[PDB]
Ligand binder design. Sequence first.
Ligand code: ATP
Ligand code: MG
Lengths: 50, 221, 100, 40, 240, 121, 121, 50, 57, 119
Amino acid sequence: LAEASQAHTKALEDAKSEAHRVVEEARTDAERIAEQLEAQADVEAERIKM
Amino acid sequence: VFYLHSRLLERCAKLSDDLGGGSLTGLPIIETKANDISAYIPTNVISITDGQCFLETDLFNQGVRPAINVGVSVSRVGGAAQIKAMKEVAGSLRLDLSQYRELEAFAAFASDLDAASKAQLERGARLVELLKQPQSQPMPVEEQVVSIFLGTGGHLDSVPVEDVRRFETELLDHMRASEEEILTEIRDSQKLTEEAADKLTEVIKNFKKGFAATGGGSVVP
Amino acid sequence: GQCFLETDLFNQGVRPAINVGVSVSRVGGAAQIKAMKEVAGSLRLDLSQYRELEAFAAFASDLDAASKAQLERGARLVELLKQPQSQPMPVEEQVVSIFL
Amino acid sequence: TEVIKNFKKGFAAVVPDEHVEALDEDKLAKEAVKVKKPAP
Amino acid sequence: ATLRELRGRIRSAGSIKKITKAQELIATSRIARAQARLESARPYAFEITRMLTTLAAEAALDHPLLVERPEPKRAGVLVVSSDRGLCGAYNANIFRRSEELFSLLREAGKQPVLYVVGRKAQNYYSFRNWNITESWMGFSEQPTYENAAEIASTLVDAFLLEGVDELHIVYTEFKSMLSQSAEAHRIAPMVVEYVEEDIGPRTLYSFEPDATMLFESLLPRYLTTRVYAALLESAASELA
Amino acid sequence: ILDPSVVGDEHYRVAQEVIRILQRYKDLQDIIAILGIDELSEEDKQLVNRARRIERFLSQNMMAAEQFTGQPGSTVPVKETIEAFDRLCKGDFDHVPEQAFFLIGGLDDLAKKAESLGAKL
Amino acid sequence: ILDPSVVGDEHYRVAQEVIRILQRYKDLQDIIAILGIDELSEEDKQLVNRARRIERFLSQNMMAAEQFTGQPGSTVPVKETIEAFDRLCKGDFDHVPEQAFFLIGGLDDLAKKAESLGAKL
Amino acid sequence: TGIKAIDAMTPIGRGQRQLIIGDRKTGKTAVCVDTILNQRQNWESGDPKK
Amino acid sequence: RERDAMVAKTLADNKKSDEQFAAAQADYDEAMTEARVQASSLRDNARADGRKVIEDA
Amino acid sequence: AELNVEIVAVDRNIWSGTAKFLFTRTTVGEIGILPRHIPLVAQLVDDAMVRVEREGEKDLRIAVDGGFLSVTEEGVSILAESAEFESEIDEAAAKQDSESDDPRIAARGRARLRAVGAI
Ligand SMILES: Nc1ncnc2c1ncn2[C@@H]1O[C@H](COP(=O)(O)OP(=O)(O)OP(=O)(O)O)[C@@H](O)[C@H]1O
Ligand SMILES: [Mg+2]
C-alpha cells in the first residue's frame, strides 16, 4: 500500500511534466504555423497587386 | 477520324539525346455518355494512348474524389515513370486495393472473417481514404511518398477511418514545419533510405501521441 | 397530358389500365368541378407514392404502422378506381366514390 | 358522412385439407428409456 | 430504351451475385461453428442417458411421462423452423413432415396441438388458419440451453395436465453435410424397452435418497436435453 | 458554384453528405428489391431509412403547382435548408414516419405534419 | 488439337487431370482467401498442396531470361512433360517444398533443385 | 501530376499519352488543371531539364 | 477481534491499493487526453485566425 | 492411485482430471469420494459446491448448478446445468443475488458464494 501510494503521485507528477512539455511543443508549432500563414497572406496580397 | 486523332497523338514523343532530349506529354480528354467506353471515338483514343484514367460518376458521388477507377485505370509505361521512393511505397498499394475491393462484400461480417481478412478490409478502407484529394491542391512527390508511406506502412491502422484525411494533412503540415530534412532527402535522392524511414517512423509516433481524433480517443497503438 | 395504358396493369385486373405513376393531365384542377377538385386533390400523388411504397416493401418482414396504413389505403383506392367497360358514372357519383 | 356511416352497419361484409397422406408410423421415432433389466 | 435497361439489369444481377456468394461463405463459417456446438453438447447427453437407464434399472416405471395414456385425445407437436429465410426447401421440408405427422395423428383420433419455434413456421401456420398455442423466436441460429429448458418445460407442463396425451417434435436431423432430413420424433410418453441384462453379478448401485425419486427428477432433464440436441441439429441443418 | 469557396463549408458538407447517402441508397435498391431489406446490415438499414426520408424531404409544394395539388406553396431560406438537411443526415428525425416529409416546406411544416400523424421531433 | 486423335491418349489424360486439379483449386481459392486455409478439409488440403505444386511446376526457366540470370533456357520434350505431370498428379512430389518447383526444366532439374534444398525423392 | 491516385497507381512519364476519360462532371478538367498547377515548383527551379 | 480487524485491514489494503494502482493510469491517461485536446484546440485556433488574416489581407 | 473426475456441463466439458478426494453435497447430506468407492448415483443439492483436491496443487472449488453425481469403477462424473470455478465468481453480484426471491437464481447465488469461500 505504501509503495502504491507513492507510485501514484510519482506517475501523477510525471504525467503533469510530460503533458506540459507536449502542450509547450504545441504552442510552439502553433506560432510556427501562424508565421507561415501570414507569410502566405502577404505573398498572395503582392500577387494580386501585380 | 482514327487517323485524325492518331496523327495528333503520335506527335507527343520523347526525343533522343541526339535530337535534344525534349518531350511532349499528351493528356487527351474524352467524354463518354453513360459510361459507354465502347463507343467509336472512346475506342479509338483508348487504342491510341499509352494508358487511361477512367473517372466515374458513381465514385464521384460516393465521395471518392478524384473519381478515378483504380481497378480499370492502367498505364502501360508503369513503374518506369516513377521515382524509386514512389515506386516502392506504391507497389504495396495495387494488391491491397484489389483485395479490399474483393473483400468489401463482407464489410458487414467482419466477425465471421479471418483475422487477415479483416485486417485487409480495414487497411483497404484506410487506403481508399488516403487517395482522396481536394481540388486545385496538388502535392509534390515527396509529400505523396510520405502519405503513401503512412497508408502502406500500417501507420493509419490506429486512426479512425473518418479521420485519416485530416491526420495525413496534419502530419505533412508538421513535417513541413519541423522536419524538412526528410522531405529534402526524398526530393533530392528520389529514394527513401532506411535512416530516413526510421526518422519518419519516429516522427509519426510522436505526432500520433500528439494527435487528437474526432471520436475522442487517442490514436496511439 | 397522357393516359398511359399498360398490358401488365390490364392483366392484373386494373381496368382502365391507366399507369397512375406516369399518367398526368397538364390542366389539372381547372378541368374539375369544385367537389371533385377538393375530394380528388392529391389522389394521383397518393397513388404514385403507394405504388412506390409497395414496390419497396414487397419483401419487408415487418413494417411500421404508418406504412401499413398507407398500404391498406392504397389497396382500397386502387380497388375503388376499377370500372367495367361502357359503364359511365355521373360526376356526383364519382365525387361520392372518391369521397368514400 | 352520416349516410355512409349508417349504411356501413347495414352492409353485409378453417385449416385447408392439404390432402397429405399419413406418415408411416414406423418413421415416427420413439424416445425410449432403454432399461437393461429383462421383464417384458 | 432497352439498352440502358439491360445494362441496369446486368448491374443489379452482379450485385445479387456478390451478395449471395458472400452469404454462402458466411454460411460455411457458421456451419463449422454449429457442428462445433453440436459435438460439444453430445457428452452430457450421453452421460445423462446412461444415468437415466441406470436409475430405470431399479425404478418403479409408473411416471406419467413414461406411461401410455389410454384414450389419447390431443397431441402437442413442436415444429422447429428458422427465422431468417435465405435457406432452401428447409422450412418446406419441415412443413411437409409436420403435415404427414398431422395426418398420422388424425388417423388415430388425436387433435394435433401446435407449438412452433421460428418465424417461418408462424407464417406457414397463420396463413393456414392454425391456432398456435405458443411461439418462440429469435434463437433458431444460436440456441442456448435456456431456450430448450423453457420449451421443454412448457411442453411437459402441457403433457402432465388445455392438456395433451403425447408430444412430438418435427425438426431437421443433420448428417454428412450433404443430406439434412426432416424428422418427426415422439418425445413423450417414452417407450420402455427392456433391451438386455448386460450385468448379472454387477456391483449394485446405491441411490440417494432412492431410485424412484431420482428417476422422476431426472426424466424432465432428459427430455429438455433431447430438445436442446434437437435445436442444435436444426440450427446446423439450417446453416447447411 | 457548389464550391466550399462560394457556398461555405457547411452548405457544401451537407450537400456532399446528402449526395453520398442517396448514392448508397441507389446502390442498395436492387438488393432491397430482390432479397429484402432485412438482409442488409444495421448500418445499411439506418442509412436506407435516412435516405428515404431525405429523398422525400427534397420534394416541396411549389407555388406554381397549386393547380395540381390544391395546396399552397412554400418558401424555405437556404440556412434553414442547410440546418434541416444537417439534422436529417445526422439522424434527428429517424423516428418520424416517411410521410410528413412529403411535399412540405421547412422544419415548422415538418413538425406540423409529423404531429398530424402522431409523432414528434 | 488437345485431342486424343492428335496428341494421343496419355497426353490427353494427363492434361485433363491437371486441368481438373487446377479448376478445383481455383474453386477452393475463395474459401481459402476469405475464411482461411485452416477451415478446409483434409482431402481438400491435400488437393490444394498438390495443385499449388502443379501450378508452380507449370513455370519454366525461359530462354528469354538467360540475359538476366545466366542460366540457359530449358527445352523439355513433350514425353518428359507428360511423365513429370503424371507423377505430380499421382503425388510423388507432395513432400518437396514449393520453392523447388519455380523456374526449372524437366524432372532431373526438379530432383537436383530439391536435393539442393535437403529434400530427396 | 500532383495527384496521389495517378502518381501512385497510373504513373505518367515524359512522352506518354494518358487518356482522361469519363462521362461528365467527374473531374477531368480538374485533373488536368491540377497537373498543370503542379509544375509551378518545376518552373521556379529555372532548370530547363526540370 | 483485532486479529479479524488485521485480516480485514489486509484485504481492504490490497483492494484499495489495486484500486489506486489502476486510478494511477486512469488519471495519467486523463491528463494526457486533456493535454491532447488542449494542444489540438491550440494551433487550430491558430489555423482559423490565420485563415482570417489571409482573407482580410 | 487416484480417481478420475469429469464434470460436464449441459453444453461444454467443464473440467476433467485426476483427484485425491472429491467433496460435494447430495440432497441426503454431505459426501466425500475417495479413490475407490461403491457405485452411487445421487442428486446434488440446489446450491451445491464441489471441492476437488488434487495431489500437487490447491483444492479446486466449483459452484455447480443443476447437478447429478455418478460414482463408478472408473471415477466420478458430475452433470451440471451451469458450473463456475472459484477463480471467476464475482462476490458482489453473487452476494447481492443471494437474497433474491426467485428460487433458482438464489440457489445459483448461494452456490457462487460457497465456491469462493464465504458462507
Ligand atoms: N478532387 C475534387 N474534389 C472535390 N470536387 C471536385 C474535384 N474535382 C472536381 N470537383 C468538382 O467537380 C465539378 C466539375 O468537375 P469538372 O468540371 O472538372 O469535370 P469535367 O470533367 O470538366 O466535366 P465537364 O467537362 O462535363 O464540365 C467542379 O465544380 C468541381 O468543384
Ligand atoms: Mg471539362
